[PDB]
C-alpha cells in the first residue's frame, strides 16, 4: 500500500534491534560465517491508528500484504536472507511492531597477525530504501539488542554485542545517511595451543642442542638432521589448523627463526669437526664451549624482540 | 484464519510428540548431527464441531489454508526444517489431529573431557510464541515419543530418547513463549580405539626403552630419535580428527606425558655417554641400571594418577 | 481428488515396480549411496470407467494435476526424492497407469568383517499410509522390476535386484501402513588390493627379517627401525579408507600381528647384542639360528589360523 | 496446444542440435562433469501458416505458450536440466524454430588404464516423448552442432564433437522411442608429468643403485633403506592427483616393479655381506660385478615388456 | 510485454554498468571467483511517456513485472545469477531507469608461467538477443562502472576495473548478438612466499653441501639422503597448491634443478669414496677441493639464466 502521509514535518524514524540466537561455522579461509537471529522493527504511522472504543484489548493484528512495511537490506551477505514473518501488533497510538526470524551468510575481514592470541570484530551492515514521499532514517533501541544464553562458537568466546547509528554509508545513490553497523567482539581460546604446539617444539630444539656436549661426528650429524626432519614433520600439525594466510604472522616468524637456528647449528658442527681433524683441538673445544652458552641466550633474546615487535 | 475463540479462562494447550526414524552424520569438529523424524500435534478448536448425525460418521479432514495451524519452530537448527504434511483430521468432539514429517540439522555442544570413553547428551528444543489474542503453552504426549528399532548411528549406540514434561515459560521481546526439551543420550563404541591406537604406541615406547640395555652411543641415538619421529606421525593421525578444546582432555595429557618421557630418555643417554668418555664407567653403569627400573614404574604411577584424576 | 469408495470392506492394491538406471557414489564412511530410476504404479479407480463405444474412441490420457494419485514415500532416505511425472493413462475398465523418474541418497548399514573380500546387500523401503475412509496395500509386479545393463558401480559387481513380494503390515501413529523391500546384492572387486596393499607389506616385512644374518648392531638397528617407520606410513595410507567399527575386522588383525612381529624382532636383536657383549657367542649364535627358521613358520601358521577364523 | 495431425505421409521429424558454450569440473572420483550449451529444435506444422499477403510482412511470429512443443529429456543426468526458452519463431511456410539454454550434470564412464597417456569419450543422450496422434523421431542437424573456441578443460584438449543416431534398445519402455548420441573426444596433455613424477623417481632409484660400488655394509644398508623410505614418501605425494581406482593401472604396475627391485637389491646386499664375512671374497666380488650390469638391463627390458602389454 | 517499435530502421541501445561490491574465493585449481555487484540498465521507450503537468508527478515507477525489460545474461557463468530487483523508475521523456543486485560464480582461465610473481586478468561477458524486428545493441555508462573501495581479495592487489566500450557483433544461430567485456586486473602479493618457501629450501641445500668438508663415508651418505627426504617433504608442501599446467613454470624448473643437484652430489660422494679406497688420496682431495667452489657458482649461474629466461 501507500507510505504514511508526510503531513508530519519531522523525518520518519524506524527503530531497529537484532537479537542473536546462534552463530556457527566461522570459516577462516573464506572469512565467512552464518547467523540466526530476530529482527525487530517499529515506526509511527498516524494514518492507521486505533481508538479504545472498539475493544478493551487495545491490541489489533494485521497481515504482511495489507500494510506497508519498509524494506531493510543487508549489505555484506552472500544471498538474500530468508524471511519468516512472525507477528505484528498495532497500538491505538499508531506505533507498529514488526518481527522476523532470518538466517544469513556474512562476509567479514579477519586479521591473523597475532594468530594464537588475536581478537576479532565481526560486522553486520543494514541499509534502507528511500521512499519517494518522506525521509527514512534508522535508530537503535538498546532493549531490542542482545544475545541468547546458548550462543556458542567452537574455540571462541563472545565478549559483547552492540550497535551504532553511523549514517556514513559510502556514497552510491542517496543512501549516504542510512547505514547501521553491529559489532561482535570475540576472542580466541589459546590455552590448548601451549601443550599441543609450543612445548613439543621446544623439546625437539633442546634435543637437537645436546650435540654441543659430544665430539662424535656421526652422532652429531644424526641428531641434528633427524631433529630437522622431525621439525619439518611437526610443521604439518602446525599447518593443518592454521589458515593459509598470504601475509606475515607471529608463528611464521617463529618457524623461520627455528630453521635459521638449525642451519647455524649444522655450520657449527661442521667447523668443529674440520678444526679437530687439522690437529687444532683447543680451538674446537673453545668454540663448542662458547656455543653451549651462546645458543640459548640468542634464542631467548630473539624471542623477546619478536614478542615486543608484534604485541607492542 | 483466526485463532480459536478465547474462552477467557484457560490458555490454549498443544500436545506434541516426536518419533525418530534415523539419525546420521554426527560431525565431531562442528558438533552437529542430522535427524529425520515425525511430528504430531493436537489441540482443541471450539468451532469445526459436528455431530455424527447427518452422515457425520466420516470424520472431517480439512487441508492447510482452510484451518488454523500453530507455528512451531526449532530453536537450535541451522535452517528452517524441510517438512511436508501427511494427514490432518478433526474429531467430532472438537479436537484436531495433525501429522508431519521433517528433516533438520541440529547444533549441540559436546564435552570431550574423557574423549575415548565419553558419553554425550543431545538436545532438541521446540518453541511457540503466544498470539496477540490468546496464550499458548506446550505439553508432552508420552505415547507418541520414541524411535525405530532400526535407528543406527555410525560409531555410537543409542540409549534413550525422552522428553522433559515441564515447559520453561518466559517472556522474550514483550511476548510470552514456552519451550520443550528432548534428550537423546548416547555412548561411544571404544573397542576400535584399543588395538588401532593404544597398543602400537605402547609397543613403540617399549622399543625405544631398549637403549638402556646397550652401551653404543650411535645405536642409542638412532633408536630414540627414530621412535620420536614415529610418535610424531602417530600424533598426526590421532589429532587429525579431534577438535580443539578450552580445557584439558585425557589423550592430550597422555601425549604430553610421552613427550616428556622421550625428552628425559634423551637426557639420560647423553649423560651416560658423557660420563663414560670422562673415564668414570662405574657411575654410568649405576645410572643406567637405576634407569632400567625407574622408567616403567614412574610411567605406571603417572598413568594411574591421571586415570584417577579424570575418571574419579 | 478423493479416495475411491470400497465395494463393501475390501482394501485397495497398488502394483509397484522399480527399474534401475544408474548407481554411483557408494560411500564407506557415510554408508550411503545415490541412485536414479523409474517408479511405476498402477491401481484401480472405478469412478472413471471409460466407455469407448459412444463417449469418444481413444483411451484418455491425463495430467499430473486434478487426479487422485497415491502418496508413496521412501523410509531410508536423507531427503524427499526429486521426481518428475512422465505419463498418466486410464484404461477403459478403470485401471490407471502411472510413471515417473526420481533420484535420492539412500541410507543402509554395511558389514566389514571381511573387508577386502566382502559381499553386501542394500535395501530400499517403500511405504503408504492408509486413509481414514480406505485401506491401501502394496504389491509387486515382476514385469517392471529390473536394471539396465548400463548400470555400473565403480568397484563393485552387481548380481541381482529383486523384491520381496510379501509386505510387512504394522500399526504406527494410530494408523495402518504397508512396506515393501528391494534388495540389491553386490560384491567387491578385490584384485587391485593385492599389488596395491598386500605384497609391499610382505616385502617390507622380509626386508626387516633379513637382519638375522648380520652380526652388526648398528646395521640391525637401522634395518628394523626404518622398516618399522615404513610400516607405520603404509598403515596410515591403508587406514585412510576403512572406518572404525565396533567389531574386529581382518585387516586390523593382520596389522596388529605385524606390529607384534616387529616388537619381537627388536627384542631378539637386543638380546643377541647383550649376550654377545658378555663373551658368550655360542648362545647368541644358537638364538639367531633358531630365529631364522622360527619367524617365517610362525607367521605362516598365524596367517592360516586367521584366514580359517574369519572365512570359515 | 495440440499435437500435429498425422497428415503427412512420413512421421513428424524434429531437427536437433547442441552447441557447447563451456565445460568445467570434470570430477574423476564420481566420473561426472557439468555442461553449458544451447539446445535448438526445429519442426514443421502446416496447420498454422502466415501467407505473405494481408499485412504478411511479418515473416516470423512469437508464440510462447499457445503452441505445441515436444518434450526433450536427457537420460544420464543427476537432475533435470535448468533450461529457459530464449527464442520462438514461426516461419510463414510452417517450419517452427525453437531454442533454449540449459545447465546439467552428466554421468559418463571414465577409463584410467593408460592414465598418463589416455583419451576419453563423453556421451550425452537425448530421447523424445511419443504422442498417440503423430510419431516423433529425432534427427540431428549438422549446421546446428558445434562448440565455441572458448571452451576449455583444465588439463585436457578437445579433439572433436559430433552426433549420431542410436536406437534405444533399453529402458523397457513399452512405447517406441528414439535416442541420440553426442560424443566429445578429449586427450590429456601429458607433458607436465615427465619432469614432475617420472624423472625424480628415476633419480631416486639410480641413487639407491650406487650401493654396488662399495663394500661398507652400514653405508649400503643406510642407502637402500633410506631410499625405500623416500620412495614411499614420493608415492604419498603422487597419490594426491590420481583417482581412487578399483582396477589395474599402468602406474600401479610401475610402482609394484619398483618395490620388487628394492626387495631384490636388499637381498643382494645381504648375500654379499654374508659371503664376505664367511671368508669367500672372490664370490662376493663376482656377484657385485654381475649385479652392476644386471640391474639396469633387467629394468629396461621389463619396462619395455610392460609398455607392450599395455598400449597394444 | 512487447518490444518498443522502431521508427524506421534504427536499433535500440541500452546503457549498462557494474558497480563492484566484493570479490572472494579465487580458486586456482578450478579457476573460478565468486562476485556480487550492482547492475544498472537504461533505455528509451516512448510508448509510456507522460505529461508532468497533468499527472502531477516527476518520476513514475512500476512493479517489477508488467513492463518490457530486456533479457540480459552472462556468458561465462556456472549457472544463472541470483537476481534481486531493487527499483524501476521512468523519466518524463520515456527513458527507463533500472537497478538490480546479483551474485554469481564466474569462469576464467589463468596463466601460471610466473606463478610466484604473476598477474592476471579476469573477464565478465554480457550478451543480449535480438527479439522482434528491433535490433538491440549495448553501450557503457562510464559514471556507473566502478568498484567499492572495500573490494578486497585475500592475497591479491586490485589495480583497475574497466570495460571495453566497443561491443562485438556476430551472427550466432542465424541471429545477431552484441557482447561487452569487463576486465579486472589483479597482481599477486609475493612477500609471504619468500620466507615460507624460498629460504628454508636454500638452507636445506646448503646443509646438503656441507658434506664436501668431510671424509667419513657414513656421515656424508646420511647428510645427503636425509636432506633429500626433507626436500621431498617440502615438495609435497609446495605441490599442495599449484595445479597441473601444460607449460613449464618457474617453480617447477627450480625444483627439477634442485633434484639434479642432489643426484650430482651423491655421485660426487660415491666417486670420492671409490677413489680413496683404491689408495689414491690425492685425486680425491683435488676433486673435493674443486667441487667445494664449483657447486655454488654453477647454482648461481643456473638461477641467473632461469630468471633471465622466464622474465625476458
Ligand atoms: C615392559 C618394559 C620395557 C621392556 C623393554 C625391553 C626389554 C628388553 C629385554 C632385554 C633382555 C636382555 O638384554 O637380557 C637378556 C638376558 C640374558 O642374560 P642371561 O645370561 O640369560 O642372564 C643374565 C645373567 N647371565 O636374559 C634373557 O635372555 C631373558 C630373555 C629376555 C626376555 C625379555 C622379555 C621382555 C618382555 C616385555 C614385556
Ligand atoms: C626362509 C627359509 C629359511 C630356512 C633357514 C635357512 C638357514 O638356516 O640358513 C642357514 C644356511 C646353512 O648354512 P650355515 O649354517 O649358515 O653355514 O645358510 C643359508 O643362509 C643358506 C641360504 C638360506 C636361504 C633362506 C631363504 C630361502
Ligand atoms: C619367506 C622368506 C623370508 C626370509 C627372507 C630372508 C632373506 C633372504 C636371505 C638373504 C641372505 C641369504 C644368505 O646369506 O645366504 C648365503 C648362503 C651362502 O652359501 P653357503 O656356502 O651355505 O654359505 O646361501 C646362499 O648363497 C643361498 C642363496 C641365497 C639367495 C636367494 C635367497 C632368496 C630368499 C627369498 C626368496
Ligand atoms: C641406466 C644408467 C644408470 C646407472 C645406475 C647407477 C649409477 C651409478 C653412478 C656411478 C657410480 C660411481 C662410479 C665410480 O665410482 O667410478 C669411479 C671410477 C674411478 O676409477 P679410475 O681410477 O678412473 O679407473 O671412475 C670414474 O672416476 C668415473 C667418473 C665418472 C662417474 C660418474 C659419471 C656419470 C655416471 C652416470 C650418470 C647418469 C647417466
UniProtKB/Swiss-Prot annotation, chains A, B, C, D, E:
- What keywords appear on the UniProt entry? Cell inner membrane, Cell membrane, Ion channel, Ion transport, Ligand-gated ion channel, Membrane, Potassium, Potassium channel, Potassium transport, Receptor, Signal, Sodium, Sodium channel, Sodium transport, Transmembrane, Transmembrane helix, Transport
> Which InterPro entries did the record assign?
GABAA/Glycine_rcpt (IPR006028), Neur_chan_lig-bd (IPR006202), Neur_chan_lig-bd_sf (IPR036734), Neur_channel (IPR006201), Neuro-gated_channel_TM_sf (IPR036719), Neuro_actylchol_rec (IPR038050)
Q: Give the UniProt subcellular location, in the record's own words.
A: Cell inner membrane
Task: Describe the effect of residue 238 to M.
Answer: Displays an increased sensitivity to propofol but not to desflurane
Protein topology in the membrane: Multi-pass membrane protein
Q: Which GO terms describe its molecular function?
A: extracellular ligand-gated monoatomic ion channel activity; identical protein binding; potassium channel activity; sodium channel activity; transmembrane signaling receptor activity
Give the Periplasmic compartment stretches of this protein.
Answer: 1-189, 241-248
Give the UniProt entry's GO cellular component terms.
plasma membrane
Q: Which residues lie on this side of the membrane: Cytoplasmic?
A: 213-215, 278-280
Q: What does the entry report regarding how activity is regulated?
A: Tetraethylammonium (TEA) and tetrabutylammonium (TBA) inhibit the proton-activated currents in a dose- and voltage-dependent manner in vitro, whereas the blocker of acid sensing ion channels, amiloride, has no effect. Channel current of GLIC can be inhibited by inhaled and intravenous general anesthetics at and below concentrations used clinically. Ion conduction is also inhibited by lidocaine and by divalent transition metal ions such as cadmium ions.
Q: Which SUPFAM superfamilies match?
A: Neurotransmitter-gated ion-channel transmembrane pore (SSF90112), Nicotinic receptor ligand binding domain-like (SSF63712)
Q: Give me the segments passing through the membrane.
A: 190-212, 216-240, 249-277, 281-312
Additional detail: The homologous nature of GLIC to eukaryotic nicotinic acetylcholine receptors and other eukaryotic pentameric ligand-gated ion channels, and its sensitivity to general anesthetics, define GLIC as a structural and functional model of signal transduction in the nervous system, also relevant for exploring the molecular basis of anesthetic action.
Query: What role is this protein assigned?
Result: Cationic channel with similar permeabilities for Na(+) and K(+), that is activated by an increase of the proton concentration on the extracellular side. Displays no permeability for chloride ions. Shows slow kinetics of activation, no desensitization and a single channel conductance of 8 pS. Might contribute to adaptation to external pH change.
Domain comment, as recorded: Consists of an N-terminal ligand-binding domain that encloses a wide aqueous vestibule and a transmembrane domain that forms a narrow channel.
State the oligomer form and interacting partners: Homopentamer.
The family annotation for this protein states: Belongs to the ligand-gated ion channel (TC 1.A.9) family.
| Record-given protein name | Proton-gated ion channel
Q: Which gene encodes it?
A: glvI
Amino acid at each position: 500500500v501507500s507510505p504514511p502521509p508526510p503531513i508530519a514535518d519531522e523525518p520518519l524514524t524506524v527503530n531497529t534491534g537484532i537479537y542473536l540466537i546462534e552463530c556457527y561455522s566461522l570459516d577462516d579461509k573464506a572469512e565467512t560465517f552464518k547467523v540466526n537471529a530476530f529482527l525487530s522493527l517499529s515506526w509511527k504511522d498516524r494514518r492507521l491508528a486505533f481508538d479504545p472504543v472498539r475493544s478493551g484489548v487495545r491490541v489489533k493484528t494485521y497481515e504482511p500484504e495489507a500494510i506497508w512495511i519498509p524494506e531493510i537490506r543487508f549489505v555484506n551477505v552472500e544471498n538474500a536472507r530468508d524471511a519468516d514473518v512472525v507477528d505484528i501488533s498495532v497500538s491505538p497510538d499508531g506505533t507498529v511492531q514488526y518481527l522476523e526470524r532470518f538466517s544469513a551468510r556474512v562476509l567479514s575481514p579477519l586479521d591473523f597477525r597475532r594468530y594464537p592470541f588475536d581478537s576479532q570484530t565481526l560486522h553486520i551492515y543494514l541499509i534502507v530504501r528511500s521512499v519517494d514521499t518522506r525521509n527514512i532514517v534508522l535508530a537503535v533501541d538498546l532493549e531490542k539488542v542482545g544475545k541468547n544464553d546458548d550462543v556458542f562458537l567452537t574455540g571462541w568466546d563472545i565478549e559483547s554485542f552492540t550497535a551504532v547509528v553511523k549514517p556514513a554509508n559510502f556514497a552510491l545513490e542517496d543512501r549516504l545517511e542510512s547505514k547501521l553497523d553491529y559489532q561482535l567482539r570475540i576472542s580466541r581460546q589459546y590455552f590448548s595451543y601451549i601443550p599441543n604446539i609450543i612445548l613439543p617444539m621446544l623439546f625437539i630444539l633442546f634435543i637437537s642442542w645436546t650435540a654441543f656436549w659430544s665430539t662424535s661426528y656421526e652422532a652429531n650429524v644424526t641428531l641434528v638432521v633427524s631433529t630437522l626432519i622431525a621439525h619439518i614433520a611437526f610443521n604439518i600439525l602446525v599447518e593443518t589448523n592454521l589458515p593459509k594466510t598470504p601475509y606475515m604472522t607471529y608463528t611464521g616468524a617463529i618457524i623461520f627463526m627455528i630453521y635459521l637456528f638449525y642451519f647455524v647449528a649444522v655450520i657449527e658442527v661442521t667447523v668443529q669437526h674440520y678444526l679437530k681433524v687439522e690437529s687444532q683441538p683447543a680451538r674446537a673445544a673453545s668454540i663448542t664451549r662458547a656455543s653451549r652458552i651462546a645458543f640459548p641466550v640468542v634464542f631467548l633474546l630473539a624471542n623477546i624482540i619478536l614478542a615486543f615487535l608484534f604485541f607492542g
